Amino acid sequence: GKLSEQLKHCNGILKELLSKKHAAYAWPFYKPVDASALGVHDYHDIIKHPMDLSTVKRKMENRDYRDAQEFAADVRLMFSNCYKYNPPDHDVVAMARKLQDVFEFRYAKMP
Numbered sequence: 001g002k003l004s005e006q007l008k009h010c011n012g013i014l015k016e017l018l019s020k021k022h023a024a025y026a027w028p029f030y031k032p033v034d035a036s037a038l039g040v041h042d043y044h045d046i047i048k049h050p051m052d053l054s055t056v057k058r059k060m061e062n063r064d065y066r067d068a069q070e071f072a073a074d075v076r077l078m079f080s081n082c083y084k085y086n087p088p089d090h091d092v093v094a095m096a097r098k099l100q101d102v103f104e105f106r107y108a109k110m111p
């Protein structure tokens with residue numbers, strides 16, 4: 001079935017977040033955190049609800065989101081996990097802030 005008009009706008013935002021023009025700051029958010037691979041053995045004790053853009057994309061393809069609010073809560077959860085785990089001066093936090101600016105300004109243009 002066809003996404004609602006608001007969910008079409010959300011899918012457009014998601015495609016933009018995954019696109020080459022934002023890759024320089026978006027790439028850490030592309031796939032789930034692999035805590036063992038990165039050596040962050042406390043990650044799952046601190047972050048109880050992991051989220052990333054590939055998971056948001058699978059949920060949109062599977063029609064899991066029933067409205068725009070549910071989609072936005074997942075994208076914001078992904079940024080909040082980054083702000084919770086890392087110190088505020090970390091390089092990856094600066095990248096999160098820049099991608100979140102892209103997201104919030106386009107989300108605000110919702111039909």
Ligand SMILES: C=CC[C@@H](C(=O)OC(C)(C)C)[C@@H]1N=C(c2ccc(Cl)cc2)c2cc(OC)ccc2-n2c(C)nnc21
Pocket residue numbers: 028029033038039040043082085086091092
């Ligand atoms: C989860 C690990 C904490 C954080 C970190 O210190 O990672 C390292 C690898 C130990 C430096 C890590 N930094 C990064 C990170 C650190 C510096 C720069 Cl310039 C870019 C991303 C990170 C890297 C990844 O590579 C596949 C995946 C997820 C990353 N991420 C996210 C999302 N949130 N925090 C991070």
Ligand SMILES: C[C@H](O)COC[C@H](C)O
Pocket residue numbers: 097100101104105
């Ligand atoms: C940088 C804050 O964590 C998120 O700011 C969003 C604003 C639209 O730039």
Ligand SMILES: [Cl-]
Pocket residue numbers: 072073076
């Ligand atoms: Cl929210």
